[PDB]
Amino acid sequence: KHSSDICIVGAGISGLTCASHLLDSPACRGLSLRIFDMQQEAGGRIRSKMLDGKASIELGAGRYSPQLHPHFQSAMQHYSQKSEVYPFTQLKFKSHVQQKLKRAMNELSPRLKEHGKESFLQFVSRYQGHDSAVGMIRSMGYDALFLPDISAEMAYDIVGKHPEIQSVTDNDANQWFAAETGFAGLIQGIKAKVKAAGARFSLGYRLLSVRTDGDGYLLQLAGDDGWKLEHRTRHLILAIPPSAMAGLNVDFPEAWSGARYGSLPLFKGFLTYGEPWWLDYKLDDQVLIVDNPLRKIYFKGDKYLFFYTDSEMANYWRGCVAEGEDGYLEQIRTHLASALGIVRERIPQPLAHVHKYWAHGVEFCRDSIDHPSALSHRDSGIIACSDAYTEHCGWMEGGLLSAREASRLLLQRIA
Amino acid sequence: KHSSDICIVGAGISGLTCASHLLDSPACRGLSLRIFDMQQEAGGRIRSKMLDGKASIELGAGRYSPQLHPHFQSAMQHYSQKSEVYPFTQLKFKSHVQQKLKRAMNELSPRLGKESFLQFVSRYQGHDSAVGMIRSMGYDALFLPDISAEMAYDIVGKHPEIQSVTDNDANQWFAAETGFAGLIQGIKAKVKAAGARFSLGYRLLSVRTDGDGYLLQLAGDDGWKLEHRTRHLILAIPPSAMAGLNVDFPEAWSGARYGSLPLFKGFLTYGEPWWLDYKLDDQVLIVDNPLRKIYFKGDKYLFFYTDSEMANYWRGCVAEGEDGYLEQIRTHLASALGIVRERIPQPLAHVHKYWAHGVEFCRDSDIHPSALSHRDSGIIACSDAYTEHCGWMEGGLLSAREASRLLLQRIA
Ligand SMILES: Cc1cc2nc3c(=O)[nH]c(=O)nc-3n(C[C@H](O)[C@H](O)[C@H](O)COP(=O)(O)OP(=O)(O)OC[C@H]3O[C@@H](n4cnc5c(N)ncnc54)[C@H](O)[C@@H]3O)c2cc1C
Ligand SMILES: Cc1cc2nc3c(=O)[nH]c(=O)nc-3n(C[C@H](O)[C@H](O)[C@H](O)COP(=O)(O)OP(=O)(O)OC[C@H]3O[C@@H](n4cnc5c(N)ncnc54)[C@H](O)[C@@H]3O)c2cc1C
Ligand SMILES: [Cl-]
Ligand SMILES: [Cl-]
């Protein structure tokens, strides 16, 4: 036996793109390439489903901007994937609370040269105190902004990149699209191309440890039916995120970067009904940001509705799922009712629903000193590859950037 | 608050039947009952699938006998599950060694034994000749040293394909018509309607005694850490999963020692039933080559079933690539029927399943209780591996009666 020239652990968008660059290179003519992923389907945090077979939903990544994510758009085009307009870029009720924050973030703006290391909360509290800063930050519907490990300078960035709140900063001309059939369509297209150029996949295997071994490396993997397996290879990319790196045999992060990394969890839930009852309220294609636990509420045409939350509120919803389905559904009815200013009895019960919880939905770096796109083990020559090593940490575009640099460091290992 | 009065970990046939007996009991009125299992669906080593919209298949347990398993045959009827005749009760195309096989088994049966069946069967016959005839029976457990020659005659006599090699050719074999999934769903529906709550997809990592009750660590299959407090606790899991836990198994439970061996099944559907041309439907061939047992089910499909070292052989091919695995099957099919490879079609669809611990058993003649109790904490462990019927669903039912009785005791 079980052996290869090059091995990529991780069949997310980073690892699949790594494989695509390598196989396009003359200097790999004739080499063998093996790809492992601990899951049954490629994709990582890209996961499309069919909700009640009536419409495609995105349990993971769902949106991209041509302004922010041009390599991603070019990937969509190269693989003939249809894009559709993403509507949730405005509010039917931008509150004065929001436009106050627009006015207070621009007012406060010329201070981040000196103070931008402070937490975003500690920052905004300098305008109209702290109770007013909480009401303003909370109206943006992304509870990660309260975390002390989120600085003020990196908060202004977060706000400008997300489509619901991007007009609070002068980043409002950006456009947004979604895959018309599901982002899994792109994943399958790259996967087919890499397979047809001779790669071989072993989906369902988890890497456990790795030891350097002469000129190559010996990897210990475990199948999800318990079958133990050993693989030998001469060149190794780990296209996994930092949290998974930290639980391996290598010296991460000390011997790799120096910097420290964190992560926050994400939760999304979708509900279908027999009738599109929100059309009477003129809510199709709209998004509401509320202070109750659903945080962001989305109505998608005829088709369905969903909510999307993060950090402490993600953990809240996943506790309800653990206390039982009825009750989870029933607290959605309560909070939907108050978001619309009506009584629980006007909100029907769903036919079918789906949810997903990501223990490490988004992983980021906690510095910047100039951090490179992909990393290299100080001692063994293993290469790491993650969205979390780029300026686009938290976005698919970040995966494609790190893949290009990572696949270039390994090309020079090969000459 | 995340807690219960009673907790059962394991939603195989043992765990669900444990829950079924408890909710039937008057002494459990008022009390709360929570069932965990690490899989997303219930049934353990019972697993029914649909290969092609055509037919349902058994990735795990597939057959029972009314004579050998009266309680299982009774569960089927208590839940109104239709049965069907299991055809693979006869080796219609015997090989030379089959004929000698009945004769030597009745011939060696005097010798009192408890020794490894390979060394024994080669005591009164040539060693290279014993390998020839043991292997004609199609189950490579029979070559393991950890299996006595006593154990081996009990194995030959209870499997539908070689039972006529003993004076047991008169047992009947049945399969489920819609799959044993239908028996699992029946018990699950009952236990849920009496008010039990399922947390499927959670895996128990450890357990700690805590005052009068116990405190459980669980991990969801998406990472969510969980803690559950209960007062009474059944662990309806096999020994191999007892060993990976917080508790001192087996040292502090039985003082016996247990083993296991792995199993593999593979199913193939085609465009046209090419095997009828050989008068081969509803028939089973035992061959020497890696497929070890080849079954032909009417028009619908063929499969193969192997154990122990051959089970690892096939799981190996799978890890080297789906293609070529299919080509191994196609080479070995050709030698089994004695034709060239190019006459054997490739299949439309196929499914396989590998069971790292397919069957687990006890290594002793400890005249083995049906369920166990932890000397100190009062935790009860439930498994087919503790009974005379280990490796059979009937043992899960028997271990369940006992485990729920030891618990109903302690509740008063
Ligand atoms: C809720 C949510 C919403 C999102 N929304 C957006 C959005 O709208 N726009 C956008 O651009 N991005 C979004 N993202 C991010 C997007 O999912 C990208 O894929 C992500 O930024 C990085 O992809 P990746 O290939 O680097 O890593 P991953 O997709 O995380 O892939 C890593 C893979 O390696 C595998 N793996 C890990 N560890 C091991 C091991 N020890 N052995 C073997 N195999 C292993 C994993 O199974 C995984 O498949 C969202 C993410 C989440 C969770
Ligand atoms: C290939 C194969 C063929 C078979 N053919 C037959 C046959 O024809 N006739 C027959 O009678 N029997 C057959 N069997 C055996 C039959 O499947 C078993 O005897 C019976 O199902 C065992 O029931 P059980 O509840 O004791 O254990 P299991 O079926 O093993 O259920 C145990 C459950 O505990 C769960 N679990 C384990 N550990 C943990 C943990 N730490 N946390 C949470 N949950 C946990 C598991 O997910 C599992 O669901 C076959 C088995 C195999 C593998
Ligand atoms: Cl996002
Ligand atoms: Cl069996």
From Swiss-Prot, chain A:
E.C. numbers: 1.4.3.23
Record bears the keyword Flavoprotein? yes
Tell me what the record says results from K268 to Q/S. Retains less than 2% of wild-type activity
Keywords associated with the record? Antibiotic biosynthesis, FAD, Flavoprotein, Magnesium, Metal-binding, Oxidoreductase
* Record bears the keyword Nucleotide-binding: no
Q: What is the effect of changing Y308A?
A: Retains 5% of wild-type activity
Which reaction(s) does the protein catalyse, per the Swiss-Prot or TrEMBL entry? L-tryptophan + O2 = 2-iminio-3-(indol-3-yl)propanoate + H2O2; 7-chloro-L-tryptophan + O2 = 3-(7-chloroindol-3-yl)-2-iminopropanoate + H2O2
What GO annotations for molecular function exist for this entry? metal ion binding; oxidoreductase activity
Q: List the disulfide bonds.
A: none
Q: Where does Mg(2+) bind?
A: G12, G15, A239
- What is expression of this protein induced or repressed by? By N-acylhomoserine lactone (AHL).
The pathway it acts in is: Pigment biosynthesis; violacein biosynthesis
- How is the co-factor bound, per the entry? Binds 1 FAD per subunit. Binds 1 Mg(2+) ion per subunit.
- Per UniProt, the enzyme's principal EC class comes to oxidoreductase
Q: What is it used for? A: Violacein production is used as a biosensor for the detection of quorum-sensing AHL production. Violacein possesses antibacterial, antiviral, antimicrobial, antileishmanial, trypanocidal and potential antitumoral activities.
Q: Which residues bind substrate?
A: R63, H162, Y308
The record's note on quaternary structure and interaction partners says:
Homodimer.
Q: What is the documented function of this protein? A: The enzyme generates the imine form of indole 3-pyruvate (IPA) from L-tryptophan (L-Trp), with concomitant two-electron reduction of O(2) to H(2)O(2).
How is this protein named in the record?
Flavin-dependent L-tryptophan oxidase VioA
Biological source species: Chromobacterium violaceum (strain ATCC 12472 / DSM 30191 / JCM 1249 / CCUG 213 / NBRC 12614 / NCIMB 9131 / NCTC 9757 / MK)
Curated annotation (Swiss-Prot), chain B:
**Residues holding substrate:** R63, H159, Y305
What is this protein for, i.e. what is its function?
Answer: The enzyme generates the imine form of indole 3-pyruvate (IPA) from L-tryptophan (L-Trp), with concomitant two-electron reduction of O(2) to H(2)O(2).
What does UniProt report about how this protein is used?
Violacein production is used as a biosensor for the detection of quorum-sensing AHL production. Violacein possesses antibacterial, antiviral, antimicrobial, antileishmanial, trypanocidal and potential antitumoral activities.
Q: What is the effect of changing Y305A?
A: Retains 5% of wild-type activity
- Inducers of expression: By N-acylhomoserine lactone (AHL).
Residues annotated for FAD binding in this entry: S14, D37, R45, R63, L204, M393
What Gene Ontology molecular-function terms does this entry list? metal ion binding; oxidoreductase activity
Provide the taxonomic classification: Bacteria, Pseudomonadati, Pseudomonadota, Betaproteobacteria, Neisseriales
The cofactor(s) it depends on are: FAD; Mg(2+)
* Protein's GO biological process: antibiotic biosynthetic process
Result for mutant: W392Y: Retains 60% of wild-type activity
Q: Subunit structure, briefly?
A: Homodimer.
| Family membership noted in the UniProt record | Belongs to the flavin monoamine oxidase family.
Q: Which InterPro entries match?
A: Amino_oxidase, FAD/NAD-bd_sf, Zeta_carotene_desat/Oxidored
The cofactor note reads: Binds 1 FAD per subunit.
Q: What is this protein called?
A: Flavin-dependent L-tryptophan oxidase VioA
Pathway(s) served: Pigment biosynthesis; violacein biosynthesis
Q: Which gene encodes it?
A: vioA
- The UniProt record lists the EC number as 1.4.3.23
- What is the organism of origin for this protein? Chromobacterium violaceum (strain ATCC 12472 / DSM 30191 / JCM 1249 / CCUG 213 / NBRC 12614 / NCIMB 9131 / NCTC 9757 / MK)
State what changing V359Q does: Retains 17% of wild-type activity
The UniProt record gives the binding positions of Mg(2+) as G12, G15, A236
Q: Which reaction does it catalyse?
A: L-tryptophan + O2 = 2-iminio-3-(indol-3-yl)propanoate + H2O2; 7-chloro-L-tryptophan + O2 = 3-(7-chloroindol-3-yl)-2-iminopropanoate + H2O2
Keywords of the record: Antibiotic biosynthesis, FAD, Flavoprotein, Magnesium, Metal-binding, Oxidoreductase
